[PDB]
């Protein structure tokens, strides 16, 4: 199995209310393990996973600092983008960024990324070659040159291919017992009456981890993917996920319908139907 390290960083100006709010959240494959929020009492990078307690007082200082550094940096960014878009100094705006790296099971690099956005829409992003940039609008077209001229691209690549893939392994080792685990999805179906002799059948899948799972409803061997309904997989508050998919079927004719659960911890896809 491949793995990745993703950073979600967000900056939000809030005029009249003080300095922007900066936050950083990091994940190693679906489990939050570190974070920083400028609005805590004492803004300090801190752990979100036990395995991260395995780190010396040093690590936590270098991060807390390079964090406070980025804070200033996006803080300047926000004002910069205001000139780029001829926007009012009075409005509140957002900068989102996601940077990180994926790897293969050999521990080698698979993919590296970093992309900015601004007030919810695409801004700039590092192409897959890790050498060129793709700018969304002409404002981002400027930042593109600043970085071309400052070799920011190769500066980043050094980071992705180096520091990023390396700590990924470190992490993956500190808490492999938590990150390389597989919790199997326990399932069941619920039944709900409806108008016009119709019936809604829901298929629940719980306590599973990796978040990646598939649910389908089948009738005589064909998946009714189109006349179905589901919810983006979700965290259940203890480090595992869950999902549900439902389908409307005619009353009295529901045992002709089955649910199919596809997950890493399921050697054999789960198959269930209703239990009157």
């Amino acid at each position: 199995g491949p793995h990745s390290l993703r950073y979600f960083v967000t900056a939000v100006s809030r005029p009249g209310l003080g300095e922007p709010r900066y936050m950083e959240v990091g994940y190693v494959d679906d489990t939050e393990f570190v974070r920083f929020d400028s609005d805590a009492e004492n803004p300090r990078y801190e752990p979100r996973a036990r395995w991260m307690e395995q780190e010396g007082p040093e690590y936590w200082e270098r991060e807390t600092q390079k964090a406070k550094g980025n804070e200033q940096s996006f803080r300047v960014d926000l004002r910069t983008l205001l000139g780029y878009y001829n926007q009012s100094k009075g409005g509140s705006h957002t900068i989102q960024v996601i940077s990180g790296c994926e790897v293969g099971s050999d521990g080698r690099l698979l993919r590296g990324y970093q992309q900015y956005a601004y007030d919810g829409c695409d801004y700039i992003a590092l192409n897959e070659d890790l050498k060129t940039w793709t700018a969304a609008d002409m404002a981002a077209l400027i930042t593109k040159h600043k970085w071309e001229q400052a070799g920011e691209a190769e500066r980043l690549r050094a980071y992705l291919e180096g520091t990023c893939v390396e700590w990924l392994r470190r992490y993956l080792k500190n808490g492999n017992a938590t990150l390389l685990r597989t919790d199997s999805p326990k399932a069941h179906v619920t039944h709900h009456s409806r108008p016009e002799d119709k019936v809604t059948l829901r298929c629940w899948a719980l306590g599973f981890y990796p978040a990646d799972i598939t649910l389908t409803w089948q009738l005589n061997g064909e998946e009714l993917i189109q006349d179905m309904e589901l919810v983006e997989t979700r965290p259940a508050g203890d480090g595992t996920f869950q999902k549900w998919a439902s389908v409307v079927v005619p009353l009295g004719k529901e045992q002709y319908y089955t649910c199919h659960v596809y997950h890493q911890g399921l050697p054999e896809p789960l198959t269930l139907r209703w239990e009157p």
Partner: peptide
Amino acid sequence: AVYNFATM
């Protein structure tokens, strides 16, 4: 772990 982000 975290990157040193650049200015825009």
